[PDB]
């Protein structure tokens, strides 16, 4: 339905196996955003390490971490990497 006009969720649509509209109902939130730097033969190379958490709000939480020179791609990586790492968390009385 045009929800994913970039194609980033297609690769994830196979691992977890659920519609793209259902991937947008998950609660995502960027938690950490580090500005790391690697010294190379061509000078400093600054990257953006981010950690994103994904959960449906009913006992599933996934943690993902990725980095890239672009802050936009680093968040989309962890987002996809966190939705596929979701695991059931036991909760007493769901509270």
């Amino acid at each position: 339905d045009g929800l994913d006009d970039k194609g980033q969720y297609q690769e994830l649509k196979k691992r977890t196996g659920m519609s793209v509209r259902q991937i947008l109902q998950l609660k995502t939130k960027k938690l950490v955003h580090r500005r790391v730097v690697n010294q190379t033969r061509l000078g400093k190379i600054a990257s953006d390490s981010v950690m994103v958490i994904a959960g449906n709000g009913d006992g599933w939480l996934g943690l993902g971490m990725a980095k890239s020179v672009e802050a936009s791609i680093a968040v989309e990586k962890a987002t996809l990497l966190a939705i596929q790492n979701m695991q059931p968390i036991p909760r007493y009385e769901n509270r």
């Binding site: 690769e11 649509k13 196979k14 691992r15 196996g17 659920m18």
Partner: protein, 290 residues
């Protein structure tokens, strides 16, 4: 002239001699007395046993552990003692664990599960291939490419699949599903040398896949789900275990298919194919309305 002409006669006489020699071999080959042949090297492949006793396991050197110095004290539960400088694995512990794995390989095959027999050693190729034929499973006799389970989307990308019904006969109409479906993963791995390939067993524990392994005295028993304490360095003990597990799968597939003929399916559509069905109805609903 006369020298090379001799070969022409010999090369032309091989068919006649072979036929005559084959016939003569059926006349006087067995006349003296009956030989009590009770062991043939290639007997675990031509006709493996359904169940291994203590005599079979001992004769196959399934109790020879590694040097006492090179041991993992974690698996001190299966050791019987010490002799000839090596640890002797208990023949009873090897049989009880082998009978349990056979019950695991049988049920997984009874529920339509995909088994994988993994033995990667110089001479373990005929054993694994034979076990797979019986259990209708997949074989692997070379270095397991790291990531074939956790990174299956890339490694097993172009490998073809097929959809089969209860009676294992292919179904038509899943052409669009076999292009977006992601590659498969073994529902059960049977490693004949867990000490060698730990990258495979780790992907199974990381992907929640049961495993069966032959734990030698120096192998870490926490690498698999169902251990089989035995000698993995012996080519004669591995062919016996694989035969038992191979026959277990065969006996499991027989029950599954025999039950299908009675309209009793021992398994339900996997989640992956299940989701495709729901989308099919959604797309079909539009045709009904429109």
């Amino acid at each position: 002239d006369e020298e090379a002409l001799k070969l022409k006669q010999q090369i032309e006489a091989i068919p006649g001699n072979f036929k005559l020699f084959k016939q003569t071999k059926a006349q006087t080959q067995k006349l003296g007395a009956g030989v009590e042949v009770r062991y043939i090297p290639e007997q675990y492949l031509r006709n493996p046993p359904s169940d291994a006793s203590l005599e079979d396991l001992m004769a196959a050197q399934a109790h020879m552990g590694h040097n006492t110095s090179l041991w993992n004290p974690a698996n001190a539960r299966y050791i019987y003692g010490v002799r000839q400088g090596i640890h002797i694995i208990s023949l009873e512990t090897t049989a009880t664990h082998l009978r349990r794995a056979a019950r695991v390989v049988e049920e997984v095959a009874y529920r339509g599960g995909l088994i994988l027999f993994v033995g990667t050693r110089p001479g373990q190729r005929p054993i694994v291939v034979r076990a797979a034929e019986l259990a209708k499973a997949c074989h692997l006799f070379t270095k397991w490419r790291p990531g074939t389970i956790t990174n299956r989307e890339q490694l097993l990308g172009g490998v073809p699949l097929t959809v089969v019904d209860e009676l294992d006969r292919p179904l038509s109409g899943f052409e669009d599903h076999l292009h977006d479906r992601r590659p498969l993963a073994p529902d059960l791995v049977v490693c004949l040398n867990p000490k060698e390939n730990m990258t495979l067993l780790y992907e199974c524990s990381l992907a929640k896949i049961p495993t069966i392994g032959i734990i030698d005295t120096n192998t870490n028993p926490s690498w698999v789900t169902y251990q089989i304490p035995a000698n993995d360095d012996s080519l004669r003990a591995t062919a016996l275990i694989s035969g038992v597990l191979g026959r277990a799968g065969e006996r499991g597939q027989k029950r599954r298919l025999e039950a299908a003929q009675r309209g009793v399916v021992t398994w339900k559509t996997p989640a992956d194919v299940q989701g495709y069905f729901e989308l099919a109805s959604a797309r079909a609903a539009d045709a009904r309305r429109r």
